[PDB]
């Protein structure tokens, strides 16, 4: 077949009920995630082929970067709660990995202030139980898919994208196959 279990994707032994339709895991500390998001634009390319009414969920992970990694998961929870993911994703990636000016929770907060989020609003979100719940949600989701590394993407809580089984000989062919595979899995 054109799409084959074990090639472009794998199948979880224990599928996850109630999982988001398309669930991506990343870290702002992860060099491959920087490439994935800032160079290859995989999430955008996946969105360009997704059907009507299929939402992309992106969760941050704790296990890269120690204390700062956890601060970044909490700040990603703030971004989701305030709906500002598309204002902070690029400056957070660049602040951690390009300029390396993000070394503390305050440096993360500066990115939000510079992007126009009011200081009192960031702080209220940062300290909120809504955000603590979103942190726990991201952690539980990683547990449910038995997450072993990032970047990773899962469809319908059943299928895991397998970029190592795709055509890596050309970056455009690769990105297209990845997005095409997500669409195939969403309809599967
Ligand atoms: O991060 C954007 C960028 C990278 C390299 C050169 C110019 C701009
Ligand atoms: O500042 C830590 C970091 C730098 C470059 C790539 C990943 C993480
Ligand atoms: Cu091909």
UniProtKB/Swiss-Prot annotation:
GO molecular function, one term: protein disulfide isomerase activity
Residues covered by the Thioredoxin domain: 1-131
Main location: periplasm
Protein origin, superkingdom: Bacteria
GO biological process: cellular response to antibiotic
Gene3D superfamilies assigned to the protein according to its UniProt record, in alphabetical order: Glutaredoxin
Keyword terms, alphabetized: Disulfide bond, Periplasm, Redox-active center, Signal
Protein location: Periplasm
InterPro entries, A to Z: DSBA-like_thioredoxin_dom, DsbA/DsbL, Thiol_disulfide_DsbA, Thioredoxin-like_sf, Thioredoxin_CS, Thioredoxin_domain
Cellular component terms (Gene Ontology): outer membrane-bounded periplasmic space
Effect of disrupting the coding gene: Induction of the PhoP/PhoQ two-component regulatory system, suppressed by 50 uM CuSO(4).
A UniProt-annotated Pfam family: DSBA
Disulphide-bonded residues: 30-33
Function: Required for disulfide bond formation in some periplasmic proteins such as PhoA or OmpA. Acts by transferring its disulfide bond to other proteins and is reduced in the process. DsbA is reoxidized by DsbB. Required for pilus biogenesis. PhoP-regulated transcription is redox-sensitive, being activated when the periplasm becomes more reducing (deletion of dsbA/dsbB, treatment with dithiothreitol). MgrB acts between DsbA/DsbB and PhoP/PhoQ in this pathway.
Similarity comment text for this entry: Belongs to the thioredoxin family. DsbA subfamily.
Name of the protein in question: Thiol:disulfide interchange protein DsbA
Upper taxonomic lineage: Bacteria, Pseudomonadati, Pseudomonadota, Gammaproteobacteria, Enterobacterales
This protein's encoding gene: dsbA
């Amino acid at each position: 077949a054109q799409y084959e279990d074990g090639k472009q994707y794998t199948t979880l032994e224990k599928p996850v009920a109630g999982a988001p339709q398309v669930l991506e895991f990343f870290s702002f500390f992860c060099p491959h995630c920087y490439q994935f998001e800032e160079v290859l634009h995989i999430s955008d390319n996946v969105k360009k082929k997704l059907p009507e009414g299929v939402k992309m969920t992106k969760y941050h992970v704790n296990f890269m970067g120690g204390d700062l990694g956890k601060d970044l998961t909490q700040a990603w929870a703030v971004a989701m709660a305030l709906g500002v993911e598309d204002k902070v994703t690029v400056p957070l990636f660049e602040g951690v990995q390009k300029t390396q000016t993000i070394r503390s929770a305050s440096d993360i907060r500066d990115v939000f202030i510079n992007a126009g989020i009011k200081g009192e609003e960031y702080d209220a979100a940062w300290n909120s139980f809504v955000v603590k719940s979103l942190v726990a949600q991201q952690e539980k989701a990683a547990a449910d898919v038995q997450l072993r590394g990032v970047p990773a993407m899962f469809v319908n809580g059943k299928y895991q994208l397998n970029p190592q089984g795709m055509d890596t000989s050309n970056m455009d062919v690769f990105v297209q196959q990845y997005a095409d595979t997500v669409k195939y899995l969403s309809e599967k």
